[PDB]
């Protein structure tokens, strides 16, 4: 008696520590898997997550407190812990039993003839708590005696005030035996027996006989196996370039030919009753050439090379495959697992396209294993304790003189029953790791240039970004950290907010037209015109849109604005607004390259750009042209530029106006006419331009916003002063990669005007709408494999 207690105290405290550590680690890792890995949410696995909660709340609260008791030799706590900890254990046991029952019933539904899942989780927790409430409101602290030394004890009060609690105390043991141990086993056995009978009588011969007839008909040599030639015997499959991969996936054992069992298994992947997971796993294994369980760069490249043909170059295809790998690698191992694959292509709904008329099962192995393992673990953990309780109920008798050995047996059995019940709340992660392949892979992933520049890499000790590092990285398709990009864009907006409406710029000066996200062409422009380290620049606007590298242009231009705020000048374009950016590809550019917060920061910076410049007291530089509401420079200087450009007013006229088609030779005297092409602003005339130039004493006006084949255009020469009145500059070579035009840049120095031309430069290719290769390819894979399976089986 005394010796057993003294020996088992150490065992109990070691058990408590071990359960503490293992339960915390395992349940935390399991919940992490549930809430980071996107595939795990699809099934009833979130019920498993609830079980983790049903353990964690018990482990971190109830276990340590008991530890103190194990070294207190008495009861040191008050009514609060005496009422709290057993409530926690009853709540946890109720959570576990209800979760197992509900999950078993749910998948009995699943294999036989969601909001309901969340409602079921809530109902499970509410019922567990309400059923554990009587236990909590039951206990009390009483000090009666210990034959001389009074001591307090936490237990059921021998007398209860209410009749309900008297009934509870009378038959508490059988209530705990029935609802918590008899009901779970009974329900799970009943539903598993029903599932066994379901697969029993639902088994038939019709589909099997028809598939056997098709197998025999296809088997030309009557060898019982299907080779490549027998599959190619159908003329309809000679035009499908996904034949060999599907033939390989049907061959599970890797012997080169498909037998009847493998034929049935391969066909069953496309049943009307199959789950989305089976279709997505088929899609993954299509690219998984060597069946290592992971998609790598090379295998994906070869698969899409076979699919596409010669439509695309090798270099651009390799670049976009590398891009897909980089974006889809959530753990940095250089390869794409199934988990990441279905996190990527989960929303394409291509699984619904791979539909064939068949009904066979290859599933029901894994998850049935898991659920039976969980129920068996629960049954085995509370089995010794119940056996000890029933042995005490039946054979124990204090009146028997031969009683000491009965104590020596019952106490040790009770110790074992307590310890095993404790270990159960820290064994579910281990059970899942040992029984389930998906859970084991997920735990293995968790427990065990794509480099992103940080603030210490971009900003020096003085807060000035190093332009060369950003330059090289953004040249090499590199990306930036969210914090660094947001910092750059926000404080660039802060710098630009301080500039006036109309900038005073003196010679020498370099003026460039529309860039439209052509980062490599922007590189060629800076190379031709000279480095910004010693050259003043005036960009007329349109830094984004129509391109696939706009965020790079934004980052680099506002980066130079950080470094060179006073030698670099930027003017607003019409494409930096809500409407045009959401209409064109810039929004998806920000969504794929970064987060939407980067988009918001970029738009806020766009809102702060100046509008126009006064160059050398002779010239006026804008993006579009004149307005009927603008007669003097004072009208431009009073504009509120820190807003969305409205559909009407000097804002829209400055950002959208274009000259007439016959500028310089217009038939009438109308200064301004309606602008149908843009849908807003107005066409302005040579008389209007001369009026504005003479009235304000300006010599010429520089603009952008019209495509030019030569990259520049001087309009009609002015009569009074003899200088070209309006000059349009375009600096986006190969605009939209279909125009094949040139680009020009305007240099003014020593009263000398020189226009320098440059052409397009190579840039990496992107699929339309910034998608990865998997989103590009999945529907075609699904359609061709479905057509193959329909041509073979259905006939």
């Amino acid at each position: 008696p005394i010796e057993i207690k003294e020996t088992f105290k150490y065992i109990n405290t070691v058990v408590s520590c071990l359960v503490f550590v293992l339960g915390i680690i395992g349940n935390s890792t399991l919940l992490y898997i549930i809430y980071k890995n996107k595939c795990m949410r699809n099934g009833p696995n979130i019920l498993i997550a609830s079980l983790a909660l049903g353990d964690l709340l018990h482990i971190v609260i109830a276990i340590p407190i008991n530890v103190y008791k194990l070294l207190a030799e008495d009861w040191p706590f008050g009514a609060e812990m005496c009422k709290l900890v057993p409530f926690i254990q009853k709540a946890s046991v109720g959570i576990t039993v209800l979760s197992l029952c509900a999950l078993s019933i749910d998948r009995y539904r699943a294999v036989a003839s969601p909001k309901w899942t969340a409602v079921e989780i809530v109902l499970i927790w509410v019922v567990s708590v309400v059923l554990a409430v009587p236990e909590a409101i039951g206990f009390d602290i009483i000090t009666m005696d210990y034959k001389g030394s009074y001591l307090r004890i936490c237990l059921l009060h021998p007398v209860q005030k209410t009749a309900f609690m008297q009934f509870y105390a009378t038959a508490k043991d059988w209530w705990l035996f029935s609802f918590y141990f008899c009901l779970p086993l009974a329900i799970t056995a009943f539903f598993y027996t029903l599932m066994t009978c379901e697969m029993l009588r639902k088994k038939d011969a019709d589909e099997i006989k028809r598939l056997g007839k098709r197998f025999k008909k296809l088997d030309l040599d009557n060898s019982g196996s299907l080779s490549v030639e027998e599959f190619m015997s159908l003329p309809e499959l000679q035009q499908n370039p996904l034949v060999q991969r599907v033939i390989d996936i049907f061959d599970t054992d890797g012997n080169g030919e498909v037998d009847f069992k493998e034929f049935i298994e391969g066909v069953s992947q496309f049943s009307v009753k199959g789950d989305k997971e089976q279709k997505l796993r088929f899609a993954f294994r299509i690219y998984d050439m060597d069946k290592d369980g992971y998609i790598s760069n090379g295998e994906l490249f070869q698969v899409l090379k076979m699919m596409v043909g010669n439509n695309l170059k090798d270099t651009q295809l390799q670049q976009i495959v590398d891009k897909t790998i980089i974006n889809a690698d959530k753990d940095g191992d250089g390869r794409i697992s199934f988990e990441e694959f279905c996190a990527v292509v989960g929303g394409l709904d291509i699984h619904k396209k791979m539909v064939v008329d068949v009904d066979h099962l290859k599933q029901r192995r894994e998850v049935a294993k898991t659920v039976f393992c969980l129920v068996l673990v629960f049954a085995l953990c509370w089995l010794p304790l119940h056996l000890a309780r029933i042995l005490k109920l039946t054979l124990y008798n204090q009146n028997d003189p031969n009683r000491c050995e009965l104590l020596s047996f019952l106490l040790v059995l009770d110790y074992i029953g307590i310890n095993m019940a404790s270990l159960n709340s820290c064994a579910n992660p281990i059970a899942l790791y040992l029984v389930s392949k998906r859970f084991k892979n997920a735990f293995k992933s968790a427990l065990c240039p794509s480099h992103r520049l940080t603030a210490k890499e971009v900003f020096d000790n003085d807060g000035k970004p190093r332009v060369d590092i950003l330059k090289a990285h953004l040249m090499k398709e590199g990306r930036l950290e969210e914090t660094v990009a947001l910092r750059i864009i926000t404080e660039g907006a802060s710098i630009l907010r301080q500039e006036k409406n109309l900038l005073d710029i003196d010679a020498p000066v370099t003026v460039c037209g529309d860039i439209h996200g052509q980062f490599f062409d922007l590189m060629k422009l800076f190379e031709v015109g000279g480095s910004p380290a010693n050259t003043r620049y005036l960009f007329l606007g349109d830094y984004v849109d129509r391109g696939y590298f706009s965020i790079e242009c934004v980052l680099y231009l506002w980066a130079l604005k950080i470094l060179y705020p006073k030698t670099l000048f930027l003017l607003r374009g019409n494409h930096e607004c809500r409407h045009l950016t959401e209409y064109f590809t810039f929004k998806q550019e920000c969504k794929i390259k970064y987060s939407e917060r980067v988009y918001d920061a970029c738009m806020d910076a766009f809102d702060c750009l100046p509008l126009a410049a006064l160059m050398n007291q002779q010239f006026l530089c804008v993006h579009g042209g004149l307005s009927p509401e603008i007669n003097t420079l004072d009208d431009i200087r009073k504009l509120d530029r820190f807003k969305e450009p409205p559909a009407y007013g000097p804002m829209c006229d400055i950002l959208w106006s274009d000259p007439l088609e016959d500028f310089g030779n217009e038939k009438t005297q109308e200064h301004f006419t309606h602008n149908t092409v843009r849908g807003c602003s107005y066409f302005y005339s040579y008389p209007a331009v001369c009026e504005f130039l003479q009235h304000n004493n300006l010599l010429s006006i520089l603009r952008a916003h019209e495509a030019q084949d030569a990259g520049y255009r001087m309009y009609r020469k002015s009569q009074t002063t003899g200088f070209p009145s309006l000059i349009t500059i375009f600096s986006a070579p190969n605009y939209l990669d279909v125009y094949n035009n040139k680009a020009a840049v305007l240099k003014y120095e020593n009263n000398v005007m020189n226009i320098r031309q440059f052409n397009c430069s190579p840039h990496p290719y992107w699929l339309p709408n910034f998608m990865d290769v998997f989103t590009w390819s999945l529907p075609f894979v699904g359609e061709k494999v479905t057509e193959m399976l329909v041509n073979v089986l259905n006939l």
Binding site: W75, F139, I153, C154, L155, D173, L385, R389, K392, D414
Partner: peptide
């Protein structure tokens, strides 16, 4: 456990 004593435990108290 399933005894009478100075503990709260699953069925009854523990020694």
């Amino acid at each position: 456990g399933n005894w009478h004593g100075t503990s709260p435990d699953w069925f009854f108290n523990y020694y």
